[PDB]
Structure 1
Amino acid sequence: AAQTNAPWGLARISSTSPGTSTYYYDESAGQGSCVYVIDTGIEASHPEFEGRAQMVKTYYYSSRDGNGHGTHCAGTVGSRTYGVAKKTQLFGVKVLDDNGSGQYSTIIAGMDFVASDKNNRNCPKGVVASLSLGGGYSSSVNSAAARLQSSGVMVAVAAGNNNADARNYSPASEPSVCTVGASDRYDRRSSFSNYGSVLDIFGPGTSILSTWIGGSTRSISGTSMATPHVAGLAAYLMTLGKTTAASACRYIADTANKGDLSNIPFGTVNLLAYNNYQA
């Protein structure tokens, strides 16, 4: 399939080169995979989700995404227009309040929720979690992400937007999960993107057009926006049977566009997520 005039991120993940505007992808499109978006929640009722999104868990008075960011990231994963995996099931876990903040305990709870909740969900192709969040280092947060991974969820996490070594941020610094850096459309590490040895991949992170709350759309920037590309991409790849949860990161890294990013510090991988679709 070919989505024309797609967000640049989508076109980039289906291309060897920057500067193309068409997303190419196998029409399976993540059908039968699930992605948990562990964030501020999802406006399930956005027409871009076509009934494939729902809230499954909140730790606040409401399941409603009053922030937008979880909705944005859900759209990058699997909205029909802005999504990598246009047929994936999206499950919202609202661990963040509507100001984007959450306690680590609550985040941890959410991660463990997913690890169990997936046994209540029909994801014959596999399950992904997209954690578009991060604070300072915490071994409890790291180990929660690791448990989630160990349970057979492909965990994608934002490197962080500190322009620092991601070693100092959690869950970015958990080795067992996929830590995602952000790139911009001229194939540069996004100025804000964390880096370091713990990064596994880069995805599109600068000026990412996706869904927003109030049935709208907007473009925003962040490694948090890169993460759902990788997550969507794992969902897409699992559906194609190219990989499982426990290998998906390694697979995505093995099939990435290599050496294409500039301003990648020495020691950080020069890998850009690539769907490797050949139409």
Structure 2
Amino acid sequence: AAQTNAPWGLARISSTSPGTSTYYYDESAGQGSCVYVIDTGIEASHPEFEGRAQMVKTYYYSSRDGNGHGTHCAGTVGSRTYGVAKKTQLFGVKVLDDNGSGQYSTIIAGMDFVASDKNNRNCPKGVVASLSLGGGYSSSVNSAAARLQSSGVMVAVAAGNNNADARNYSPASEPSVCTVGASDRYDRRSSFSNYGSVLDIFGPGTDILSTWIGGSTRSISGTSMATPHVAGLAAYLMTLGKTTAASACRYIADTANKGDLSNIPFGTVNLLAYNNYQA
């Protein structure tokens, strides 16, 4: 299948070179997989989700996304126009408030919730969790992320936006999950993107168009935007049977575009998410 005039990020992950505008993907499009978006919530009623999104848990007074951030990330995972895996099922877990903030205890609870809740869902092709959040180092947060991964969920987390080594941030610094840096449309490391040896992979993160609350769209930038590209790609590859939750991060790195990015510090991987599609 081919989506013409796609957002640049979608086009980039189906090409060996920058500057193309078509997103090429297999029609299966992540059908039968499930992705938990652990964030500010999801505006499930947005037409772009086509009924494939639902809120399953909130830690605040409402389950509504009053911020927009969660809806944007979910859109990059699996909206019709802006998503990587256009037929995946989306589950929202609201651990962040409408200002985009949350306590580590609540974030941990949200991760343990997903590890349990997945056992109650029909996700025959597998389960992914996308975490576009983080803060300073915390061994308890890292431990929660490791548990979620261990339970059989492909965990993707943002590297963070401090232009620093991700080793000092959580859950970014947990080695067992898939830590995602950001790049821009000219194959440069995004100027804000964290780096370091703990990074596994880069995805598009600068100027990413996706869904927003109030049934709208907007373009924003962050490692928050790169993470759902990788989460969506994992769901997509798991549906095709190419990999499993336990090894998807490794498989994505193995099959990535190598050496394409500029402004990568020595010791950081030069690997850009790529779906290897051939018609």
In the superposition, the TM-score normalised over structure 2's length comes to 1.00
- Secondary structure class of the residue paired with 1:19: coil
Q: Deviations over 1:72-121 (max 9, x none)?
A: 00000000000000000000000000000000000000000000010111
CA distance in 1, matches of 2:211, 2:114: 23
Q: Deviations over 1:196-239 (max 9, x none)?
A: 00000000000000000000000000001000000000000000
Structure 1 runs (4+) deviating above 2 angstroms are none
- Secondary structure class of the residue paired with 2:111: helix
How far is 1:29 from its partner? Answer: 0.3
How far is 1:44 from its partner? Answer: 0.2
Q: Deviations over 1:226-276 (max 9, x none)?
A: 000000000000000000000000000000000000000000000000001
CA distance in 2, matches of 1:139, 1:266: 26
- Secondary structure class of the residue paired with 1:239: helix
How far is 1:62 from its partner? Answer: 0.5
CA distance in 2, matches of 1:143, 1:73: 24
- Secondary structure class of the residue paired with 1:202: strand
1:16 corresponding residue in structure 2: 16
2:93 corresponding residue in structure 1: 93
Which ranges of structure 1 fall in alignment gaps of 5 or more residues?
none
CA distance in 2, matches of 1:93, 1:15: 32
Q: Deviations over 1:42-66 (max 9, x none)?
A: 0000000000000000000011000
- Secondary structure class of the residue paired with 1:172: coil
Which ranges of structure 2 fall in alignment gaps of 5 or more residues?
none
Tell me whether 1:122 sits opposite 2:111 in the alignment: no
CA distance in 2, matches of 1:199, 1:222: 15
CA distance in 2, matches of 1:183, 1:215: 27
How far is 1:4 from its partner? Answer: 0.5
Q: Deviations over 1:137-191 (max 9, x none)?
A: 0000001000000011000000000000000000000000000000000000000
- Secondary structure class of the residue paired with 1:182: strand
CA distance in 2, matches of 1:19, 1:278: 18
2:171 corresponding residue in structure 1: 171
Cα RMSD, aligned residues only: 0.4
CA distance in 1, matches of 2:227, 2:123: 20
CA distance in 1, matches of 2:177, 2:53: 24
Identity value in percent: 100
Q: Deviations over 1:11-57 (max 9, x none)?
A: 00000000001100000000000000000000000000000000000
CA distance in 1, matches of 2:274, 2:117: 29
How far is 1:192 from its partner? Answer: 0.2
1:187 corresponding residue in structure 2: 187
CA distance in 1, matches of 2:113, 2:247: 22
CA distance in 2, matches of 1:164, 1:120: 39
- Secondary structure class of the residue paired with 1:234: helix
2:106 corresponding residue in structure 1: 106
